[PDB]
Amino acid sequence: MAYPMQLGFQDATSPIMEELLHFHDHTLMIVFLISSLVLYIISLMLTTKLTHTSTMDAQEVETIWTILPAIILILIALPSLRILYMMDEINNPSLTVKTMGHQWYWSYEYTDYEDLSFDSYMIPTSELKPGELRLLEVDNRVVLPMEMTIRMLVSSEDVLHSWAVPSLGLKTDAIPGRLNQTTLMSSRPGLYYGQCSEICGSNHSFMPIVLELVPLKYFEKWSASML
Amino acid sequence: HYEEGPGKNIPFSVENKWRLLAMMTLFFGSGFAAPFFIVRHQLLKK
Amino acid sequence: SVVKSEDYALPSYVDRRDYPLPDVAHVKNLSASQKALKEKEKASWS
Amino acid sequence: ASAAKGDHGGTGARTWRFLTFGLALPSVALCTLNSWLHSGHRERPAFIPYHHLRIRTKPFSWGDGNHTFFHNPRVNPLPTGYEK
Amino acid sequence: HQTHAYHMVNPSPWPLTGALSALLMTSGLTMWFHFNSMTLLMIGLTTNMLTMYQWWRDVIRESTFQGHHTPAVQKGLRYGMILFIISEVLFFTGFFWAFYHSSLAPTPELGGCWPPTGIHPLNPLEVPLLNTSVLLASGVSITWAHHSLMEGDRKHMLQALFITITLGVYFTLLQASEYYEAPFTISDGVYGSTFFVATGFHGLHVIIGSTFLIVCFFRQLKFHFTSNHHFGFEAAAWYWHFVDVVWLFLYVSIYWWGS
Amino acid sequence: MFINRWLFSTNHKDIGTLYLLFGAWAGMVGTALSLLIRAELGQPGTLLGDDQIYNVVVTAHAFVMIFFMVMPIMIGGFGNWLVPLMIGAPDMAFPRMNNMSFWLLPPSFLLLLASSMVEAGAGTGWTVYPPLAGNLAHAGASVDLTIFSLHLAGVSSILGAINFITTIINMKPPAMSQYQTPLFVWSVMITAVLLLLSLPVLAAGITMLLTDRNLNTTFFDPAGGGDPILYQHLFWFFGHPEVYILILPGFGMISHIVTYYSGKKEPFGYMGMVWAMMSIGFLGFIVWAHHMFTVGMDVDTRAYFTSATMIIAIPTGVKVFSWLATLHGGNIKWSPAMMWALGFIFLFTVGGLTGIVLANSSLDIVLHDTYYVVAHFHYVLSMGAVFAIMGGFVHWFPLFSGYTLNDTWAKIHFAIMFVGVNMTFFPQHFLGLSGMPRRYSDYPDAYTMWNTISSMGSFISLTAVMLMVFIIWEAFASKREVLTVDLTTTNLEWLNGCPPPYHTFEEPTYVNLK
Amino acid sequence: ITAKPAKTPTSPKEQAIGLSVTFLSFLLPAGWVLYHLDNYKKS
Amino acid sequence: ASGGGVPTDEEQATGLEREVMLAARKGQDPYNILAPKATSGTKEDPNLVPSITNKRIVGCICEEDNSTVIWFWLHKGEAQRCPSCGTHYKLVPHQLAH
Amino acid sequence: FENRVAEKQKLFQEDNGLPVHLKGGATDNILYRVTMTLCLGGTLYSLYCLGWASFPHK
């Protein structure tokens, strides 16, 4: 979860999210450099009584300010696409969980072995227990084993939704008639929150996602108890 | 032919600045007000 | 000296750093002493 | 075949008329006969209430709301089946 | 007095009547679809026809009767018509895109195949082939009409143009009959959707193009066109060829490859 | 006389004026909508008590700003006023069709307002994605009214595009090549080509949405074998070109403004600028699926759209650096117009750079549908487009009206606006990075501070807008008539005086072929 | 840009009036709606 | 396909279209369709600029392929010079119509 | 049929100051008035329909 006055990304929970953090640092450096350069040049152009208003030859200068940006773009693109193909590469999951979007809640299905499914609704603000998070807690969390590669399948039974968990670097649209696949792996136990990320009507703001990441044995027992 | 020159190439009169103020306030003010009254309308239906 | 709207197509006076010698003189109609001054200008400026 | 003819020099209107009556309209006459023979109202297929067909998400804005615009009773079943 | 060759147009009410007819047609479609009334829509359709009639009448008055169409003005209209046809090509490409998207990746609800389960496509070698010959033939005849006009031949221009129009009418009646005879409908999933919306918009364009040709027929009867100045006719011919080419793409894509 | 002049117009200047008036009125509607957005968000909890209303407001905001403020002002307003004057043409090619392009807009706007008034409105987002925009999730007339609103606006712009391309190609002096036309004329030309090619695809898509809603088609409905993602492809195939359409005339105006107030006879690297705009136009058609990185597209496709999107930085950079090189060596006049243009250069650049961050599909997974995107586009669009419009307005108002603004008041207005927009939008980057979704009526408690500051910013911009209305009043109230304008030798639009006569260039310019 | 002096000069006082009236035309209607938001919700 | 009955432009063209057609066959250009060829541009051999009135806007493309066009009002009287390149232009009024 | 274009050319180039849309005569004025009546009357009717569609019903 986000904490108050936060400026950057949520701390990374997956090694892919850690890759993204370093890639963002790389890209942001370039962004701050270019924007501050532009602002400085502006100030430079505007702070001299010296003049030169005759026709200026442009050919030499356009080489520099085409080739340099091209190189910079390649320097962004290389690690970008490395991460892209890293995300996509072969995984071998231990478990498959499905999530279905609804107006306005998520359902989850764990059907590798038994038929375990349930709905997950936002806790209304009036029903929050002390210390619980407004708009974020659900009644039934998505319990999952930590330190394990999980295949998430995402779809919807009505309109578009999108299933997101920022700290795991995850966002996958939930589209009826389609079954979208993403892979999930938490380095740590804990509670990891997200929110519906496609406008789905009136209560778009009010159908969160809460993952509960625990040791396999606790997951196994929880599963059996949810039948 | 049509009127030409400053204050004449426009579909509103600038002949009197107070009448103009009135017209400009109705014009711009009606645009700005409209969404507030549509919100109101939608709140009152249901 | 009076610039009129009807004069828009004529060369005009401007004070600019980068256009130091404008197309027209600032004063077009000289007084009698100013005309004598322009006559005196044709002799030594010392 | 690009074609198989060849013709240039003093063409214009005369050449295009030649093509109209010598090639174009004969083709249309031939396709008109081919169609006059290979028509004849054919076997209407057995009705199966497939859910991807006979879609009704909103009533149509004409008739009883359940008939398509060029509805042919012989060959177009309703969601509930053929009319008889 | 101007010393350029361009046309300063008299102030006109037709832009405003056209725009309001757009409001009446759209709000009319809404009223028809939702508050089952046709009244606004019929007013809209009436005013739209009145607008088009008077607008294009005035263009004839400006050109044929008043002489405002200098070569410069005519060159502008040529660009205008080409650009308008380009925009229409792109409109159709949206429907082709939809057709290929649906047909190349048929979903499980269709049975995972194209044509879908339960759809019996028309035979492309029967009436669709006739339709193809008809529009191709009409491209030949319009070219004859054009060459006759440029050669100063009134009678053969009229004959060729009449033939062109007749073929257009024939295509239209053939397609109306095919629509009636088709055992699938617009409500038959994505097959019906893509088929009837794409061919239906094409059909509309055929009617529009036929109407344009009919206008040129009556203008030719009344001696409007010269052997060198007849842009209305050229525009109608470009439009007609456009209609033909769109047919060919539909025929190859929907009727042949998509069966 | 009045009716003949203002309702039956066939005059490019008067139609231009109508467009400017329309756009200004639309701008107030859009602003009001923007403020309701920020009011809802300005403290935690609910203000309106109805998130369908919130979503309707968000949707209307975007449609008003894009289709009724920016496009009418830039293309309809500045385009109609300036293009024929800049090429010495007596009017547009199709002066009567020009008038229909204008008059289609009030009905288009009425349809949109109708949509918000009937049922519970169109709470869809400006993308209008099915199935949310379908006949089950948005039953009734609202979405149909929205669709028809877009159809009218589409027709208007396509006809306008036809008119502009024709005018610019056909109506220049016989000696003037395309490489002797001003950059603003190029910017309108290229914009027009984009509209001509993009809007018909939008028209196809929304018509398919219309038939899904009312004729039982299933283009976008899985039950009939359709696909919601098809709609997104069709929408964005238009939608990306649309954003270049929105900025290109701005780039054209900025080139003129920077050139003028630098006391230069010409922009630096004219052919590079032309090249840049054409390149941006072309590339703008091959990048659209960067709006769809989270829908489930293959990795190779993502790689392609990432790479192609980034390429756009190259020509855009040539423009940015060329504006700087135009300033370089200038006798800088610190007019209010120049301030707007300098603000444009910096703020556009910041916005463009966050675009490049977003182009990277891997990062975009986390940033998509967050306030980072909202920050991105209010920098490039809100600020970029608006700053160009303001700069253009201040610069050319004396041409259009014959009266001068109070420059001190205009500088005050800029200062307030600069503070406002930056306080509004800069914090939204933090909101985005920390994961706040867009299109939310309320947020988890941790996001309170940035939302609070952002909403306070929105009120500063409101004060700027109110002041702008006063400034225009004061100008018309005081009636200081223009006498002399500098640099007319390289700014032809000014050479017929202020305002120009109803008919200009009745006798055309004389240009030798040398 | 050079211009003539104002044909109908607008004094500081007249500017205060113009500004005040402009500001009120935007603030009062919206103000009324927002103040009464609560009333509307109960209906 | 041959025979008659279609009018020619000679027979049926009217108004401005006709005036343009007739002026063209006499090799004249009163409606400014063609680009004028430059003279040497000296004081002795100025570019002659027809006008139906006492002034006309000149655009000077000082050198071939210049993108910047230099614009100014040319008044009746003594030849005037382009402010950029100095080439001479002289107004020849009447020359166009009444 | 006979070529009567010259008659029309004379009619439409007559120096009577009428705009092209009214220059054919009284019929033009009538068609104009019909078109404009239907447009404005239709537009008023659309506004009424909006008003009616903007509120819930019995």
Ligand SMILES: CCCCCCCCCCCCCCCCCC(=O)OC[C@H](COP(=O)([O-])OCC(O)COP(=O)([O-])OC[C@@H](COC(=O)CCCCCCCCCCCCCCCCC)OC(=O)CCCCCCCCCCCCCCCCC)OC(=O)CCCCCCCCCCCCCCCCC
């Ligand atoms: C499913 C099938 C699909 C197939 C494909 C579809 C095909 C369908 C095609 C239908 C559309 C055809 C349009 C052709 C128009 C031809 C005009 C032309 O080219 O001549 C140039 C003509 C030149 O004439 P001119 O004498 O040289 O002088 C012109 C001057 O302006 C001065 O003259 P003027 O212009 O002021 O007016 C001259 C006018 C005289 O002026 C007047 O006094 C009155 C003018 C009234 C104008 C009406 C406005 C129409 C718009 C109304 C829209 C609503 C629909 C209602 C229709 C009502 C019809 C009255 O001349 C007339 O007399 C015209 C009447 C001719 C009577 C012929 C009747 C034929 C009936 C055939 C029945 C056969 C049955 C046989 C059975 C036998 C068995 C027993 O100039 C024009 O008229 C302007 C042309 C504008 C062209 C733009 C058209 C845009 C189309 C959109 C509107 C569509 C509806 C219009 C047609 C209505 C049909 C009834």
Ligand SMILES: CCCCCCCCCCCCCCCCCC(=O)OCC(COC(=O)CCCCCCCCCCCCCCCCC)OC(=O)CCCCCCCCCCCCCCCCC
């Ligand atoms: C564009 C604005 C123009 C200015 C207009 C002024 C008027 C408007 C007023 C409003 C003006 C407010 C100015 C405050 C600037 C603070 C920026 C910062 O500290 O950012 C730091 C980063 C670091 O990211 C992280 O990983 C966070 C963890 C590490 C640091 C946090 C340590 C903990 C500290 C917590 C307490 C701090 C208190 C809060 C401190 C936060 C302050 C808001 O944050 C991020 O990622 C955010 C990425 C933003 C991306 C924007 C791209 C454009 C580049 C910048 C344009 C200007 C260039 C010219 C150079 C600038 C010259 C103009």
Ligand code: HEA
């Ligand atoms: C004026 C409007 C406008 C303009 C010009 C742009 C310009 C760009 N945008 Fe923008 N964008 C929008 C308006 C605009 N955008 C809107 C409205 C949305 C949201 C749509 C919605 O969902 O509602 C959006 C969303 C959007 C997305 C989708 C994000 C998402 O939803 O997840 C992406 C993805 O790549 C993108 C990228 C870009 C890029 C690469 C540019 C480039 O064209 C920018 C290039 C410019 C620069 C880079 C700055 C100048 C260059 C230099 C100084 C040279 C040196 C620089 C480098 C070497 C990097 N933007």
Ligand code: HEA
């Ligand atoms: C040109 C486009 C444009 C402009 C100017 C704006 C202007 C503003 N917008 Fe934006 N906005 C969008 C386009 C624009 N917007 C789009 C496309 C979306 C996405 C909608 C969706 O998700 O579906 C959006 C969404 C959006 C959101 C996110 C809502 C959500 O995700 O829930 C917010 C939040 O703060 C916001 C706020 C503002 C504010 C405070 C302003 C302004 O108040 C900032 C100050 C600017 C002005 C006040 C403009 C003044 C101009 C004039 C008055 C014209 C003058 C005319 C002449 C001089 C002739 N808007």
Ligand SMILES: CCCCC/C=C\C/C=C/C/C=C\C/C=C\CCCC(=O)O[C@H](COC(=O)CCCCCCCCCCCCCCCCC)COP(=O)(O)OCCN
């Ligand atoms: C898979 C689904 C597909 C479904 C549909 C399929 C196919 C649809 C195709 C339909 C076409 C069918 C019939 C049309 C037939 C004839 C029309 C053309 C008539 C003609 O004769 O065209 C000529 C070519 O011009 C011209 O392209 C002038 C062009 C005007 C400018 C256009 C600019 C906009 C286009 C953008 C492209 C980029 C521009 C590149 C510029 C490079 C310049 C060297 C005319 O030359 P001209 O000197 O301009 O004429 C005098 C003034 N106009």
Ligand SMILES: CCCCC/C=C\C/C=C\C/C=C\C/C=C\CCCC(=O)O[C@H](COC(=O)CCCCCCCCCCCCCCCCC)COP(=O)(O)OCCN
């Ligand atoms: C003679 C040739 C045949 C075509 C012409 C004749 C009649 C149709 C009239 C207009 C067609 C125009 C556009 C196409 C739109 C929708 C598809 C309609 C094409 C059609 O006619 O398809 C018919 C359905 O008509 C239907 O639903 C409803 C048909 C009527 C209502 C349609 C109204 C909606 C119009 C949408 C307007 C938006 C377009 C805007 C354009 C963009 C502008 C920028 C098919 O009949 P069916 O019984 O399902 O199957 C056959 C079973 N034997």
Ligand SMILES: CCCCCC/C=C\CCCCCCCCCC(=O)O[C@H](COC(=O)CCCCCCCCCCCCCCC)COP(=O)(O)OC[C@@H](O)CO
């Ligand atoms: C059953 C009835 C149903 C009716 C429905 C259809 C109704 C209407 C559509 C029919 C289109 C008719 C267009 C008639 C145009 C006539 C005016 C004309 O053709 O005007 C010509 C100029 O061209 C010009 O404006 C060129 C102008 C061309 C206009 C192009 C028209 C296309 C309109 C299509 C609309 C598309 C809608 C698509 C929906 C998505 C005049 O110049 P010339 O011909 O050189 O004459 C001069 C010489 O005589 C001098 O010697």
Ligand SMILES: CCCCCC/C=C\CCCCCCCCCC(=O)O[C@H](COC(=O)CCCCCCCCCCCCCCC)COP(=O)(O)OC[C@@H](O)CO
């Ligand atoms: C459900 C949604 C409903 C929406 C309704 C549509 C909105 C309004 C409909 C009203 C249209 C009726 C009026 C006819 C318009 C004729 C335009 C025309 O014909 O314009 C011509 C220019 O365009 C040319 O050539 C090129 C030809 C352009 C023809 C334009 C015809 C209308 C186009 C509508 C469809 C546009 C695109 C659709 C596909 C994406 C002539 O230009 P003017 O300036 O008049 O004169 C110039 C003079 O020199 C001539 O003497």
Ligand SMILES: CCCCCCCCCCO[C@@H]1O[C@H](CO)[C@@H](O[C@H]2O[C@H](CO)[C@@H](O)[C@H](O)[C@H]2O)[C@H](O)[C@H]1O
């Ligand atoms: C792009 C433009 C598209 C143009 C669309 C044109 C569509 C034509 C619809 C035809 O509908 C027929 O005509 C009747 C009317 O003539 C309908 O009466 C129906 O509709 C009336 C609406 O006024 C009701 O009053 C009647 O009760 C009701 O039976 C009837 O169902 C149907 O056979």
Ligand SMILES: CCCCCCCCCCO[C@@H]1O[C@H](CO)[C@@H](O[C@H]2O[C@H](CO)[C@@H](O)[C@H](O)[C@H]2O)[C@H](O)[C@H]1O
């Ligand atoms: C987001 C856009 C910007 C919004 C900011 C608006 C700033 C405020 C402007 C003043 O608006 C007025 O405020 C009064 C209260 O101060 C209201 O009177 C209300 O309250 C008074 C005292 O409580 C009563 O006398 C009145 O009857 C009652 O209408 C009055 O209606 C309202 O017009």
Ligand SMILES: C[C@H](CCC(=O)O)[C@H]1CC[C@H]2[C@@H]3[C@H](O)C[C@@H]4C[C@H](O)CC[C@]4(C)[C@H]3C[C@H](O)[C@]12C
């Ligand atoms: C050839 C053309 C026009 C030159 C002219 O006729 O004036 C010029 C104008 C802009 C030029 C381009 C732009 O300057 C941007 C690029 C700059 C690089 O230095 C070379 C490639 C580059 C892509 C240029 C190639 C070429 O010199 C262009 C395309």
Ligand SMILES: C[C@H](CCC(=O)O)[C@H]1CC[C@H]2[C@@H]3[C@H](O)C[C@@H]4C[C@H](O)CC[C@]4(C)[C@H]3C[C@H](O)[C@]12C
């Ligand atoms: C009436 C006219 C006579 C010669 C003339 O006016 O120039 C002739 C010349 C060409 C004739 C038309 C053409 O031959 C084409 C058509 C042929 C059909 O058999 C009769 C209708 C048809 C549409 C003819 C009607 C009429 O007889 C026309 C128009």
Ligand code: CUA
């Ligand atoms: Cu579900 Cu947003």
Ligand SMILES: [Cu+2]
């Ligand atoms: Cu984009």
Ligand SMILES: [Mg+2]
């Ligand atoms: Mg999304």
Ligand code: NA
């Ligand atoms: Na809120």
